[PDB]
Amino acid sequence: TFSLTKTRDTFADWFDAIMDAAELVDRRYPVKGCVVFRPYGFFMENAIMRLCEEEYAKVGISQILFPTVIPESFLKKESDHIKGFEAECFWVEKGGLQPLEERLALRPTSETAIYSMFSKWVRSYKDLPLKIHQTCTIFRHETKNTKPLIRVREIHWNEAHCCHATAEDAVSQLSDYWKVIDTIFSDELCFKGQKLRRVCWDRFPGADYSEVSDVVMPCGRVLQTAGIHNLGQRFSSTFDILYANKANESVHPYLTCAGISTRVLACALSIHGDSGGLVLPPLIAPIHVVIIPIGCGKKNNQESDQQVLGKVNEIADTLKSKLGLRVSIDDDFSKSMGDKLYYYELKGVPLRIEVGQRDLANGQCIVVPRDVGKDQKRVIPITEVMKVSSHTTENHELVVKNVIKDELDAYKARLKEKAFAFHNSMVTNCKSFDEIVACIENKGGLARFPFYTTEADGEVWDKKLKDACSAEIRGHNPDENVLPGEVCALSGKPAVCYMYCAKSY
Amino acid sequence: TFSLTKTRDTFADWFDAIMDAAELVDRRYPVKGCVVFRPYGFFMENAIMRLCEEEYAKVGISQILFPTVIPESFLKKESDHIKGFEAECFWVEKGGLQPLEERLALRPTSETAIYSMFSKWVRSYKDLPLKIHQTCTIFRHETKNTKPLIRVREIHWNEAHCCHATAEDAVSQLSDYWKVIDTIFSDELCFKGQKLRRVCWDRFPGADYSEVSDVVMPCGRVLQTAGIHNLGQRFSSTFDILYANKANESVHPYLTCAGISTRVLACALSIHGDSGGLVLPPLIAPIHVVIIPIGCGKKNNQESDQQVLGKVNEIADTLKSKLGLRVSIDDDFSKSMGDKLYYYELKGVPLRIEVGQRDLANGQCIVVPRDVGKDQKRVIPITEVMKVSVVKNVIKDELDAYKARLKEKAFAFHNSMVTNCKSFDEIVACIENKGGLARFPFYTTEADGEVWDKKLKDACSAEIRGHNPDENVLPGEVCALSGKPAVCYMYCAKSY
């Protein structure tokens, strides 16, 4: 029976227990770090990735699918990329009883395979921009201490890869990627991450620079939940991607990529969760609304039951047909309300509506959002609940309005406000080594501090911080401008940026 | 430039040529049988699997995702299953530079993985039924004569697996799978296959029996394009799946499964295609309607061009926003009208809308369906094209009429490729000259029938595919081969 307040000290146990109790994943598959996505959990993952796919389509990035297997000669082409990943590669060496003539790696990430094909698809400036993405699984062997969604050896994800005529287009693409992240993470999943330029000594292998969303988790560690990279022209030279420009000069195009995985789901579940279990944003709720008939099955009350059950159906049909909501009806009269409520709250269903004989007589039903619970139940007339208004805007877009929709939207907005407040509370300004360390140890989250360099010699301080408190310098936000005359918290030299330090997953 | 006629003799080449010219897939990925799905092709495959997912969801089959890797120990548990699939296993043997403790197989199909987990998930009758499906790729190493979508080594597919309390529930599940297949194949993709109980000597390895859709391709060979299987209790025993029933008895549940792959897309493209290239059912058309401004860029005619382009945008906006259709505008004036026509013809765009000054002055536009072409173009008032009011619109009507024309023709093709035979000679003669499916009354559905299968393969390289149990045997009907009373009508064909 799941009942555990979700705090810094308890989160790790809370997460493992909720994974099982809500039947999201099954870790008992006998391959370490390869977890079964069970139905209730997979619906959430699929919803997140479908949204990504949909949003990528709107900004001209086309969905494709590559094979899982990458030939060894592809994977070894780019030096810095392969050294970064070679320990992570599963190798296929036989087909049946016979050895393959060329070994095949299961993709740890798809740059080497995709850019080998870009080399063929890109011959002229006419072929650019070339923007694709795929939703698939990748494979990482060396992943240690596996945790569902957060650190696994088979990882469900989406990767976008774009080929650009110029440096400026490449830079502009990064903003397009960030637009999609904000839509997914904040507008839809109601949480926030710290946007950073990753420290240059820990860039994506092969990248010219790497930008990330480091999300504060309830334990106080950060989780890298988006990776958005400018690969420059390095891969284009290695994989011989060349296009003839308008002057018929042969040019190496720029490459960019963006990746999100099951960690996005990890964040949404973890940040919004409470002592009763899950609290799901509407996007990823397999059931937006559970309607529960109450007080049925009484003696010589078969007629009243039919009327109650009849109205429950008319509510369900309106919510499904007119609003597109996912609705369930729990008409199992053997189960007590206590046991039903436990279960639906455990599973994080945003709204329950209770309809019974008495309330039906008064023309009312009870609507209870998941985050605030029974104490702040809403009495809403049944007529109002059935009330749907619609209009068409200038752009011929249908705008539907309804109280249950309003309640879902208000629910989202409360989750968002609470999640953003949590993030904001876990960014702490520090003016010294000691203040950063005490923050990491006592509070967790991100320690923000002015720092003297964004260049490679900053790694010296990354190591001291790691040794002192196991926190690492994650990066800085270039859009945050340092005040003149501010000094570096660590060296005393003039500050050129604010670095962010944290314990990482 | 693509202009290959699509006949029984040219189909194989026609298929290879249009895969490339339409940029559906890319065979130049240098692992044999592992092809890239390019954007235009992937839209199609994705539309088909999303529909399958949606339909399965509507009948209580929930989507899940299992790992790609299956440990060797799991894979070898069911004797006939492993004998059926061992040759086709890619074996993962190293993690980094280090050999793996236990070999991992890339899933050739997921029964052994999934039923190991059913064992853990099933405890009592209240856990049943348990119904799942997944869209993913599987791996079959031994596949030869690879051909995109039809015969590949990495195969994009959907597989559904259900666990049932009774034998009757398992039989009823097969009917649900079949309704979904009919929806996808016929209602949406506008083609037909022959439903058969697969001959018992050629069942799915580990199945009690197999049901299939064998679809007639333009070359006259048949392609197994759906596989729907009753696994009985065999796997449940092997993987220790047990449930406590209402009377607290420990009993084995019944398992069923169903699979569709990239072959569905293959059939749709192949059956509807013509000498101009693809002809796409609306479900898999990345673009339903291409709108083309015509007669623009003339000397001193910039005013009239912006009127034409303005109206072209108004039509696109109405079709996109009000009706939900996928619409593309080709206003690139640097390209010839001939090159545009050829391209959208080749890519199979259901409808072409042409808008020019001349037609704009009469308040009209030209609508050309892809299947019938410019000889049967429609001249439709623009106000009617813009009129939207169940949603009704003349362009939506043209897409529906187009869809119905595709179905009628593909169904007629199927029907013309089923030939009734009353003797061994007629079967051989049908197979050798006409192709398609040879249907004949036959004395048994059981294992002794394989003697005649062997004789037929030796004569003309055709095999007995199976029989449809729904077909009534005419009173007094005799077996075409033995003269004994017929108990079924077998279907024989050359296979892919």
Ligand SMILES: Nc1ncnc2c1ncn2[C@@H]1O[C@H](COP(=O)(O)OC(=O)[C@@H]2CCCN2)[C@@H](O)[C@H]1O
């Ligand atoms: N073990 C794991 N378990 C779960 N999620 C993970 C794991 N490892 C990484 N992720 C998730 O994959 C995301 C993208 O990977 P990235 O940042 O290294 O960039 C790229 O790879 C580029 C972009 C696509 C093509 N390559 C990571 O940010 C993390 O959220």
Ligand SMILES: Nc1ncnc2c1ncn2[C@@H]1O[C@H](COP(=O)(O)OC(=O)[C@@H]2CCCN2)[C@@H](O)[C@H]1O
């Ligand atoms: N090499 C290939 N290339 C393209 N498509 C293929 C290929 N091989 C097979 N198919 C396609 O996969 C389908 C399912 O395979 P099935 O019939 O043996 O049944 C099952 O597997 C059960 C049901 C799912 C879980 N197990 C085949 O009908 C064919 O359409």
